[PDB]
Design a protein around this nucleic acid. Structure first.
Ligand SMILES: [Mg+2]
Ligand SMILES: [Mg+2]
Ligand SMILES: [Mg+2]
Ligand SMILES: [Mg+2]
Ligand SMILES: [Mg+2]
Ligand SMILES: [Mg+2]
Ligand SMILES: [Mg+2]
Ligand SMILES: [Mg+2]
Ligand SMILES: [Mg+2]
Ligand SMILES: [Mg+2]
Ligand SMILES: [Mg+2]
Ligand SMILES: [Mg+2]
Ligand SMILES: [Mg+2]
Ligand SMILES: [Mg+2]
Ligand SMILES: [Mg+2]
Ligand SMILES: [Mg+2]
Ligand SMILES: [Mg+2]
Ligand SMILES: [Mg+2]
Ligand SMILES: [Mg+2]
Ligand SMILES: [Mg+2]
Ligand SMILES: [Mg+2]
Ligand SMILES: [Mg+2]
Ligand SMILES: [Mg+2]
Ligand SMILES: [Mg+2]
Ligand SMILES: [Mg+2]
Ligand SMILES: [Mg+2]
Ligand SMILES: [Mg+2]
Ligand SMILES: [Mg+2]
Ligand SMILES: [Mg+2]
Ligand SMILES: [Mg+2]
Ligand SMILES: [Mg+2]
Ligand SMILES: [Mg+2]
Lengths: 187, 104, 49, 159, 176
RNA sequence: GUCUACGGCCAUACCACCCUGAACGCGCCCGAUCUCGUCUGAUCUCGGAAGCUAAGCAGGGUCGGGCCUGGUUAGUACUUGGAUGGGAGACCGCCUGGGAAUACCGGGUGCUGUAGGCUU
RNA sequence: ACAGAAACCUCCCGUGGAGCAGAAGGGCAAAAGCUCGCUUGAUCUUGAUUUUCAGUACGAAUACAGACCGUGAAAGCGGG
RNA sequence: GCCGUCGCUGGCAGUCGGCAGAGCGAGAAAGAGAGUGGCGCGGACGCUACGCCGCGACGAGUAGGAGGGCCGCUGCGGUG
RNA sequence: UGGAAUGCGAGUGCCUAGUGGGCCACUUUUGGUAAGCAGAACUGGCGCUGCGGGAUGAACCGAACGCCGGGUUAAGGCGCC
RNA sequence: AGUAGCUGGUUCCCUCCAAAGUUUCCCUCAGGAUAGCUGGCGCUCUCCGCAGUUUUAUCCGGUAAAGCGAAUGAUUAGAGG
RNA sequence: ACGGACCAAGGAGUCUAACACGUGCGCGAGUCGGGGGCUACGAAAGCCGCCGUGGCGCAAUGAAGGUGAAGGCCGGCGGCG
């Protein structure tokens, strides 16, 4: 007998998309080859994200793409997001971008194209940038979800700003005892 | 009926299954709990940092100039050694040619 | 570079001692096998290697 | 069961040593504590204010807050299977500068000088400590004296 | 210590580790009867520890070597002074043996002390071993071999080859 | 050699008794108008300078007590880990490491910071 | 002097062998004890922390911070 | 030796063939580079890429969790 | 000159069942005359676990288990069974 | 189809991982909630960090032992005033 | 210790609602026609857009009255200095 524990032998991580989409898997076949047969780590990172679930592929807003693509030294680079590029009405002027995404919302396409920009698909990025050169990989906010408001210390513990689960919000719904010193205590 | 009252048997075995992890350490700790009077002034010190912004640039450039100026003035066995030299792919490239040329 | 050269080697998987042992449950100086037997390890290594 | 009293079991821990009672030497109050310092916590029963809790007696922490009379200490406390970084307020009577790091700071200064000085002299000096090595071969002179013969002594019932 | 096989006599020399106070500590020697040298050094540290403020950590073995018998082809009488612990006390004994090697006489002592007193070798401390002249021996079992014209037969010679043959037609003879 | 003021560590500095104290100090000391406080100018407070080292205080002494520090006690007592060791047990021995404390014997008897004096 | 084992006065020794509400343990000697003088920090207020702990509540406690104060010559000490 | 699991988040799209040229396992970064001047008509298998291939380690299990079933039963839409 | 040795890839987040009668052994240990008694500390076990030895046996000793061939062992043994 | 913190039962294969009888609160003691122990899903990186270990420094402690011609408490015998 | 003499067939985590997290798909600061209407399988499917009323999301906070989500520099002027 060998003295070893086996509870961590099997690493939990995706080796392929749970999705049965045949176009997603054709991209995965494409980038499986590129990740394997090139020394580019950009190809490996993209390949990994094609496996990621919906909540691990947050949408990237148009405003956030412009903000990150406006930083110095990022001119004439291709913005690459493995996800959906949503539109941000709060933006007034859209510059000329060159983006690659899995999806682009209908209204974000017109705005990007109307400004002279170009919208690629991940099969077109491979022909344009086989190794990922001249790219700017971008991600949507991962903690941008209502669920992360509810995680952490339980709401009834000191300095716990967690959001509770209440059916309705109002004066009659979990505000009396434990949330003010006047009723029992507060923390 | 009566039952067992208390024990800690098996407890250090459970504690160590996921390890007794030490607390996480960050290079910046929270200012929670520090003296309110001292924290009030520290905020005031930060609040007016920008007042001496121009002065800092002048000294830094001046300090850089002096720093750059000072720099600009200032600037086992002999057989096994030989063999280890020849066997080096780069260094012994010519030496390996010499023995090959002579061999022919 | 003993540390690197030694950790590079996998732990040697030796066979059971051919000829048996005296008593694994007591020290060498007690007529057993455990502990430091100094150069007498070589006799053991021959029977296990 | 036991009681949950704050000072249960501190009969000897917080008592003063033998013939060391009475006034507290004032140099205890003249020490300078700065943020980041390492201090050994040791409850002194003469002063009952700002007493550290018994679980912190004999632990070593780090100063993070300094007030008129006390300091804030970040000190690890193990409760069951986890270790918590705890923040305690302790009057400066019940602490002392830890000398555990002083040996290190002394070594850093010595290391840097040797590193600096050796660099200008083009030599490689050892900087890392090492565990005690097995002692090297040597000769033992007999000086013309035969080694003393020892024998076991007979038993005697010196009862 | 386990008195395994025939013991050997070892000469072990040790000392305190030199220190600033005493740059050259004195040397001590011991006669150790043991199975091997690794055991011999171990028992040395057990004896000097009992006599001196010394132990393996604060001392070293200067010399360990086997002392060979000086007259292996000559018969001698040995006197062995030893102390041992019984189930209910400690005792000093003087014993005599007839052998060719001093280490053989000591091995006879351990097997004999085990036989006659159920004494395990970890309770026996051999203090002294001397070669003794026939005139100075005390034990009647040893003195009866001090006879220049000694003679005796071998009565009732037991058959030791009792399974070759295992079955035979003739009964053995014990007279020769 | 040393003191005065303020100290740090807080007996190697304490306690008992004896001897000796140049100079300057520190004192004892002489008074109660004022400040101040008492049953009491004893103490405290105030104003002084005839006298004295008697005492405090300083240095030294004692086969001094204490205290500090070593030796011995002792590789002893105790102890971490080991054995299909012993013994009916009580307990004990050994292997691998750590390792005390009395009695008893010796040595020592304040060091020192800041400022200011005295000592040809 | 009455006055005695024990009343009150005086001198000396006295490391606490007393006292500090109470159980015990700890702490304490120009004090934390005893006696006087002035007083109400046992007041108003927001956070942090400790103890039990689930790192929840209460209870109790610790450092601060902001006001009003007391006391002291003052340093300071005090929000039971 | 064989089975499975885990790991190398390992290798294979290069079956680039007469519009040809057979390599990228090798101690030690980066090109089997491009150019400018001084007779036969032939050459296995493979690759359901959810596939195929290699190398190394490992394998107890109640309560309990998870995965995979070209395991099994009945009915519906397609298909054979 | 990543500033002791040794070994090892780590960090982090959600959701979560069963459990919440335990019991045994070395050492330490409370009550009791003691108990295969009641109650604790430490570690290791049985429970959840087969296998070689202890004739037999929850826990002892050895040793932990995919299906096999050869070899060698542990604790234990070698009159016959 | 009353309720049952209680008794009994709960139906195919293989593979992988694998407990608890402990903390606190509860008219709580045959039960729950709670933390712990488990599993699953991942994700963020990697090819500095960490450790049921030692070493070197440095603190903490009042048990084993020892002491009682040392304090407290208990206690035997003489001896000199 | 309890159930089990034997054989066949039957025999026990389901369905509705709510909630939580995970995963897959659609669209995306929006999204959803579920109620209503129009136009054998078909009680299906298709459509509506001045049918998006309405739900959830896009704003929090306070008991409430209510309020309700960056600033810096330049020049000039009035006041204090
Ligand atoms: Mg295995
Ligand atoms: Mg397992
Ligand atoms: Mg697992
Ligand atoms: Mg219970
Ligand atoms: Mg053989
Ligand atoms: Mg054992
Ligand atoms: Mg004079
Ligand atoms: Mg007077
Ligand atoms: Mg005098
Ligand atoms: Mg003396
Ligand atoms: Mg002096
Ligand atoms: Mg006072
Ligand atoms: Mg205040
Ligand atoms: Mg298994
Ligand atoms: Mg029991
Ligand atoms: Mg069970
Ligand atoms: Mg288990
Ligand atoms: Mg088992
Ligand atoms: Mg038996
Ligand atoms: Mg076999
Ligand atoms: Mg029912
Ligand atoms: Mg019914
Ligand atoms: Mg019940
Ligand atoms: Mg109740
Ligand atoms: Mg039951
Ligand atoms: Mg105790
Ligand atoms: Mg005792
Ligand atoms: Mg029943
Ligand atoms: Mg029946
Ligand atoms: Mg059936
Ligand atoms: Mg979802
Ligand atoms: Mg119909």
């Amino acid at each position: 007998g060998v003295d070893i524990r086996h509870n961590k032998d099997r690493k939990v991580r995706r080796k392929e998309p749970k999705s049965q989409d045949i176009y997603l898997r054709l991209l995965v076949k494409l980038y499986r080859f590129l990740a394997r047969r090139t020394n580019s780590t950009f190809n490996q990172v993209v390949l990994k994200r094609l496996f990621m679930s919906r909540t691990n592929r947050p949408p990237l807003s148009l405003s956030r793409m412009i903000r990150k693509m406006k930083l110095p030294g990022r001119e004439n680079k291709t913005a690459v997001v493995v996800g959906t590029v949503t539109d941000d009405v709060r933006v007034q002027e859209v510059p000329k971008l060159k983006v690659c995404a899995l999806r682009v919302t209908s209204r974000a396409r017109s705005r990007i194209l109307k400004a002279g920009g170009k919208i690629l698909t991940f099969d077109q990025l491979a022909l344009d940038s086989p190794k990922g050169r001249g790219t700017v990989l971008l991600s949507g906010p991962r903690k941008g979800r209502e669920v992360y408001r509810h995680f952490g210390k339980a709401p009834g513990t000191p300095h716990s700003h967690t959001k509770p689960y209440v059916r309705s919000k109002g004066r009659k719904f979990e505000r009396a005892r434990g949330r003010r010193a006047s009723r029992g205590y507060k923390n | 009926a009566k039952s067992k009252n208390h024990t800690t048997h098996n407890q250090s075995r459970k504690w160590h299954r996921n390890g007794i992890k030490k607390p996480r350490s960050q290079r910046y700790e929270s200012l929670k709990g520090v003296d309110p009077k001292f924290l009030r002034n520290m905020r005031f010190a930060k609040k007016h940092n920008k007042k001496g912004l121009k002065k800092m640039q002048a000294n830094n450039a001046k300090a850089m100039a002096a720093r750059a100026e000072a720099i600009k003035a200032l600037v086992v066995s002999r057989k096994l050694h030989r063999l280890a030299y020849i066997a080096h792919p780069k260094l012994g490239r010519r030496a390996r040619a010499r023995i090959a040329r002579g061999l022919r | 570079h003993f540390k690197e050269a030694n950790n590079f080697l996998w732990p040697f998987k030796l066979s059971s001692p051919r000829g048996g042992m005296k008593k694994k449950t007591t020290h060498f100086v007690e007529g057993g096998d455990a502990g430091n037997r100094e150069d007498q390890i070589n006799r053991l290594i021959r029977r296990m290697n | 069961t036991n009681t949950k009293g704050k000072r249960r079991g501190t009969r000897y821990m917080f008592s003063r040593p033998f013939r060391k009672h009475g006034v507290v030497p004032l140099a205890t109050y003249m020490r300078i504590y700065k943020k980041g310092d390492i201090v050994d916590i040791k409850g002194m029963g003469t002063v009952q204010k700002g007493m550290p809790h018994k679980c912190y007696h004999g632990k070593t922490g780090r100063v993070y807050n300094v007030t008129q009379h006390a300091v804030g200490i970040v000190v690890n406390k193990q409760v069951k299977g986890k270790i918590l970084a705890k923040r305690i307020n302790v009057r400066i009577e019940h602490i002392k500068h830890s000398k555990s790091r002083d040996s290190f700071l002394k070594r850093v200064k010595e290391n840097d000088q040797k590193k600096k000085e050796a660099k200008e002299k083009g030599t490689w000096v050892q900087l890392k400590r090492q565990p005690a090595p097995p002692r090297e071969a040597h000769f033992v002179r007999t000086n013309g004296k035969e080694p003393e013969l020892l024998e076991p002594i007979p038993y005697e019932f010196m009862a | 210590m386990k008195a395994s096989g025939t013991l050997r006599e070892y000469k072990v020399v040790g000392r305190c580790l030199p220190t600033p106070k005493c740059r050259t500590p004195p040397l001590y020697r011991m006669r150790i009867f043991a199975p091997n040298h690794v055991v011999a050094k171990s028992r040395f540290w057990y004896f000097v520890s009992q006599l001196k403020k010394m132990k393996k950590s604060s001392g070293e073995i200067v010399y360990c070597g086997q002392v060979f018998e000086k007259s292996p082809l000559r018969v001698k009488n040995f006197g062995i002074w030893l102390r041992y612990d019984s189930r209910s006390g400690t005792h000093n004994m003087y014993r005599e043996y007839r052998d060719l090697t001093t280490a053989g006489a000591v091995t006879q002592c351990y097997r004999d002390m085990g036989a006659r007193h159920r004494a395990r070798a970890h309770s026996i401390q051999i203090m002294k071993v001397e070669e003794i002249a026939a005139s100075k021996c005390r034990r009647p079992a040893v003195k009866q071999f001090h006879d220049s014209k000694i003679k005796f037969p071998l009565p009732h010679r037991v058959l030791r080859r009792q399974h070759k043959p295992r079955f035979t037609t003739k009964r053995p003879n014990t007279f020769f």
